[PDB]
């Protein structure tokens, strides 16, 4: 009775609205950190809980508070529709993933803590203090059922 369905909403360029193209070192804006992909305790084939836009500290631990906010997870393994990585890894193993750090414009509305709650008004300083522009002037989009 529960017809199988799938959905897609957003993509990589919907979070990183703008980037400063550094000359020579094209990776000037990113860092690589090892993170626990599959939860330490979970089913052998349980999907990872990481989602794009989650704040992460320097050690790869998801940021639960403004204190531990260092960067935003951006790696390709966590983008929507990339579920084909399920089952490849094993619980407790740490795999590198790219983080965005500096020289970017970030959509605030898609930045959330590890718990999924919206970014805090204090944690925004850390990202902005890193040399990034956290912005809210997003046009947005409206679908059927809205008068235009």
């Amino acid at each position: 009775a529960k017809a199988h369905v799938a959905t897609l909403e957003g993509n990589y360029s919907d979070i990183v609205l703008g980037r400063v193209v550094a000359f020579g070192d094209t990776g000037w804006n990113f860092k690589e950190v090892d993170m626990t992909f599959i939860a330490d305790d979970a089913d052998a084939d349980s999907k990872t809980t990481l989602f794009a836009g989650v704040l992460v500290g320097e050690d790869g631990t998801p940021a639960t508070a403004a204190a531990g906010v260092f960067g935003v997870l951006v790696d390709r393994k966590v983008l929507p529709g990339v579920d084909h990585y399920i089952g490849v890894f094993e619980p407790g193993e740490k795999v590198p993933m790219v983080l965005a750090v500096r020289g970017l414009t970030l959509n605030q509305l898609k930045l959330k803590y590890a718990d999924g709650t919206a970014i805090d008004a204090a944690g925004i300083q850390a990202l902005e203090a890193q040399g990034n522009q956290v912005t809210d002037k997003i046009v947005g989009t409206q679908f059927i059922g809205s008068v235009l």
Partner: protein, 55 residues
């Protein structure tokens, strides 16, 4: 204002779904005993024929 922060655009949705299908049979048979020795209901003395039963 002329010089300040700019604005950005949103994106669309691409939902997908699939469904199943059911099946329905219906069968019947006939036997000699139902035809040979019964008069047709619509006539005085016409013996029943298998064709009417099939139809």
């Amino acid at each position: 204002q002329r010089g300040g922060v700019r604005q950005h655009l949103a994106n669309d949705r691409k939902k997908i779904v699939n469904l199943n299908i059911p099946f329905f049979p219906l069968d019947r048979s006939i036997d000699r005993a139902d035809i040979q020795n019964f008069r047709e209901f619509g006539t005085e003395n016409a013996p029943a024929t298998v064709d009417a039963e099939v139809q």
